[PDB]
């Protein structure tokens, strides 16, 4: 299309965050692989900073939509926009807290996808439980994709955090993906994407880190033909 | 006798809607069935007072989230809420439009649910597609439920319109369902409603005559172990 049939690789990917909280700055090296069919696949992330200083829980959907798995008859906007490649503008916000904005791009070198990303993280509360590293778990969600115009589309999202006492800190996502090229791109209809993730961490790396693992595939629902 | 128990026969329900778009005034009033094991049924509504002064299609959700279908392992906080009955307090903020702002309360007579709200539509735009009736399909959505204290459940959705002219006016919802009893109540963990709706023009004459299909079920998500 001729995106997509180059994702029928196994790939690799780089990112590298360049970030902000409250003023205090931080970086985030990550890699992985991901095998076709993709939609499962593994992030190894280390703060180079020494120790990131938030919790690492809101950093995850900064640690590659093009790694979704979509179906037959639904159209993969991230990997279309290759191999030109395509840009990222996204905010979470969450509720009583801060506001993460960032700006990401990705190219591909052959079956590598680099990224590049800023983050502000801005207006976070520093006896809440982002800094405070009182976030357990990532609630698993289905996120909404929409149209945005001839040349993007709109990820809509809730995204739940569990906190030490067993209360939830909630983000609102809002992301636009971009595509970088001149020629005309097919803009998928409105469906979703299931993302569930999980963080880990081991003994292997002795540097700040994760091992995060993400499910994320794309699905539709049956749509109603009359109201008998 | 109370909560499931009480919705495993066939149903009716009637609405009671008290409105306002941007001062202008409207009274809805709506019935419908639901048989059991309920997830899809129909409502019949009229606008009491001519035509509406907007969109029918953003009151979608105005015109009984104890009808959704819920499997076993998931707590149907709506049905566990009667006999004392269900609140729900609403906003759904419209981007570069209005906020709808609405009060329901839910109350069980035999086997009729019968719906009291107050809505008050405020600050839309009177040339944009809500007030000019440029809204022509409803999008389906994967609702989010989530538990909310010991008493309430919070439901937060994206509802998205396509506008005639291929747009998409999108709505931030956001609705808080509390139980008015002093009983304690099993609240559900995270979970999703999926929700699928059909809007049909009946025949009118002096007032608007709409009726609206819905299929609405809820479920769970992976996990990873
Ligand atoms: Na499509
Ligand atoms: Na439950």
Redo the contacts between chains.
């Keep these: 299309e001729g995106g997509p049939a180059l994702f029928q690789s196994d790939m690799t990917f780089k990112i590298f965050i360049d970030g902000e909280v409250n003023g205090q700055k931080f970086t985030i090296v990550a890699d992985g692989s991901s095998k076709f069919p993709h939609g499962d696949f593994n992030v190894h992330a280390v703060c180079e900073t020494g120790k990131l200083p938030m919790s690492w829980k809101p950093i995850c959907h900064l640690i590659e939509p093009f790694f979704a798995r979509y179906p037959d008859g639904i159209s993969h906007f991230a990997q279309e926009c290759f191999p030109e490649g395509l840009s990222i503008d996204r905010t979470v916000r969450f509720e009583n807290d801060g506001t993460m904005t960032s700006h990401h791009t990705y190219e591909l070198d052959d079956t590598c996808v680099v990224s590049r990303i800023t983050v502000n993280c801005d207006g976070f509360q520093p006896d809440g439980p982002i800094m405070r590293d009182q976030l357990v778990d990532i ?4 996120t ?1 994709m ?2 945005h115009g001839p040349n993007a589309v709109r990820q ?1 999202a ?1 995204i ?1 955090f569990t906190t030490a006492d067993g209360g ?1 800190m ?1 983000g609102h996502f809002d992301s636009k993906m971009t595509f970088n090229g001149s020629r005309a791109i097919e803009i998928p209809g ?1 469906h ?1 994407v ?1 993302i ?3 963080q880990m961490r081991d003994t292997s790396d002795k540097r700040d880190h994760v091992c995060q ?1 993400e ?1 994320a595939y794309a699905h539709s ?4 033909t ?3």
């Design positions: 609630l698993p969600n289905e909404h929409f149209p809509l809730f739940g939830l909630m409105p979703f299931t569930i993730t999980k693992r499910v629902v049956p749509r109603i009359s109201a008998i």
